[PDB]
Design a protein around this ligand. Structure first.
Ligand SMILES: NC(=O)c1ccc[n+]([C@@H]2O[C@H](COP(=O)([O-])OP(=O)(O)OC[C@H]3O[C@@H](n4cnc5c(N)ncnc54)[C@H](O)[C@@H]3O)[C@@H](O)[C@H]2O)c1
Ligand SMILES: NC(=O)c1ccc[n+]([C@@H]2O[C@H](COP(=O)([O-])OP(=O)(O)OC[C@H]3O[C@@H](n4cnc5c(N)ncnc54)[C@H](O)[C@@H]3O)[C@@H](O)[C@H]2O)c1
Ligand SMILES: O=c1ccn([C@@H]2O[C@H](COP(=O)(O)OP(=O)(O)O)[C@@H](O)[C@H]2O)c(=O)[nH]1
Lengths: 316, 313
């Protein structure tokens, strides 16, 4: 079993999604054994080819018996909890079941199984309308949407675990198979010459490579535990994203792009302060904004705007 | 249809509990119709006698089918959501099912049924360890126990409802059938000549009469909605509570009462600032600390330390 002396058996809930599939493509070539649990609510079957070292259970983190059996059999050394429901903002029941009860079941199962470390991903919706930007890690949680409320409580339950837990509050991560948001929107619209708009909002953006680096650190024995902000700590407007994409695809506009006031629930600025993560993990994001966006675009050049292109080579 | 029409059809989840039963004893003599839904996890079957105007469904807020059936037939005008799980701090799944999923199910059912107003009760555990005490209503929520975390999310879901919602963050309410906590413990043990202890913590206490007053205003058409602290705004140590019980019962101690450090998960001081509640509702608590404690003891004097004595005939 390899990496010699550092071989992991990783159980990844939500492993068929964006971050989950990128983590598999990162870890599987290293010889780690991976078990995915996913219900394919938003994740895709085609990112999980029948390949060596990779096992898949189709099912839900809401199903505590299923998890018990999975943990019982697979005996994971490490857990990455990447499953989340969000696609229907009115389906509060689903959000609470997946994000709260799913987090509880994973924490309970991981404790019984003697998991070494659990890694959870948290949305910046946990902060609600922030008192200040960039957002300090000691900011209160103050969510006001179903996705935010349920994810805040799931994280909070995971923090009560006797399992060492790292919960990463994430900037917007970019990389293979990201097929939603302003980046692919501006890409498909500008190339097609369709009409675009930008919310007058500010966000942070993180290259996949820097995400993989902190994920790696979070799973190492005796590293820090708790909640951490993962970002460059720099905010850029949606308009700035747009200007990068427009220059990249080499289009000229007929009229100025509208930059419009955000809707009532669209938080104007959400940028995370990473300083404590830099202090405690020794980690710093290496990829600037322009390289992050253009890196996303270069992937699109190569594969299309698709969440189903796998970098793994079947059959086994 | 009395009182005339401010007659309410009130669906009260958790109706067999301390607050729910006191609310029933307060509203039923006025002529309101009440439906209770309770699974009896902590509430008692004995406090809901088969009396005109009161009906009971044994079930869970976690059962959406049951709730849809209850809402469809009873057709309530008002909901009081008083169901909560907490008795096992390690049963995170149950606190989440009852306090989060139960709150969602009740909101969704109340919206579908076009309920006029919904009242929710919130634990001060929602504030976790506060930066300022007394605790302002705009203080963040920062729970770190199962009960606090699940109750914080349940409340935040209810606030997303299109039904007008009032969620009251409460002081420690005293009154009929409160059979837990420092007050009955000191009462029983001091009378038995048994040794006690006080935790070195500060808390606020609210007489049932004041709780009843704000519950009334919360249900009135056109009144404020949102979250509100319900308290006198004054804090008192558990030792002060002790001294009140010791004086009341007439006992004399053989040793001074040991005062013990707060447990790891106990917040040293939890006292709520009700100013905004005063401003928006025109409500102020009337019964002071000593009268609040002594009125609880006078109840035990009459009925014993019991959660089953009903004032309904
Ligand atoms: N991508 C980001 O920049 C970002 C930012 C902040 C937080 N996060 C968090 O990271 C995690 C992954 O995000 P993503 O971008 O990969 O989203 P995603 O939708 O691609 O991945 C979520 C995965 O969870 C699965 N899932 C949903 N409900 C489930 C359930 N009941 N049981 C098992 N699986 C279930 C989905 O099918 C999907 O495969 C989520 O927890 C999310 O909240 C992501
Ligand atoms: N009494 C107080 O001083 C105090 C203080 C702060 C907040 N609160 C809140 O007020 C409400 C009532 O508190 P209480 O002191 O009456 O507690 P209680 O335990 O006496 O009443 C709660 C009732 O809910 C019932 N219940 C539990 N799970 C249920 C479920 N799944 N479905 C239906 N019923 C269920 C219990 O059986 C009980 O009768 C709770 O929401 C509590 O968090 C009370
Ligand atoms: O065509 C688009 C699509 C997205 N956005 C904006 O881009 C930001 C980030 O996108 P996302 O969909 O992730 O929404 P968020 O959860 O950050 O509010 C939001 O403020 C959106 O309003 C935009 O301006 N134009």
């Amino acid at each position: 079993l390899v990496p010699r002396g550092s071989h992991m058996r990783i159980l990844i809930t939500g492993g068929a999604g964006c971050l989950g599939s990128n983590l598999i493509e990162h870890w599987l070539p290293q010889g780690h054994e991976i078990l995915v649990i996913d219900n394919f609510a938003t994740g895709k079957r085609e990112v999980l080819p029948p390949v060596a070292g990779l096992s898949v259970i189709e099912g839900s983190v809401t199903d505590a018996g299923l998890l018990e059996r999975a943990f019982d059999s697979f005996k994971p050394t490490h857990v990455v909890h990447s499953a989340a429901a969000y696609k229907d903002p009115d389906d509060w029941a689903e959000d609470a079941a997946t994000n709260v009860q799913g987090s509880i079941n994973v924490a309970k199962a991981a404790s019984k199984a003697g998991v070494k470390r659990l890694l959870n991903f948290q949305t910046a919706l946990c902060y609600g309308r922030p008192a200040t930007v960039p957002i300090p890690i000691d900011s209160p949680t103050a969510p006001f949407t179903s996705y935010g409320i349920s994810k805040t409580a799931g994280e909070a339950f995971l923090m009560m675990s006797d399992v060492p837990v790292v919960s990463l509050r994430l900037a917007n991560v970019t990389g293979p198979r990201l097929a939603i948001g302003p980046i692919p929107t501006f890409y498909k619209r500008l190339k097609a010459g369709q009409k675009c708009f930008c919310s007058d909002t500010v966000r942070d953006f993180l290259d996949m490579s820097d995400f993989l680096a902190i994920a790696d650190l979070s799973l190492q024995e005796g590293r820090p535990t708790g909640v951490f902000n993962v970002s460059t700590g720099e905010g850029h407007s949606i308009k700035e994203v747009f200007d990068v994409v427009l220059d990249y695809v080499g289009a000229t506009l007929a009229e100025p792009v509208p930059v419009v006031a955000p809707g009532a629930d669209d938080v104007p600025s959400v940028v995370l302060d990473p300083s404590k993560t830099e202090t405690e993990f020794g980690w710093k994001a290496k990829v600037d904004f322009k390289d992050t966006i253009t890196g996303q675009l270069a992937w699109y050049d190569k594969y299309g705007v698709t969440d189903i292109f796998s970098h793994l080579s079947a059959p086994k």
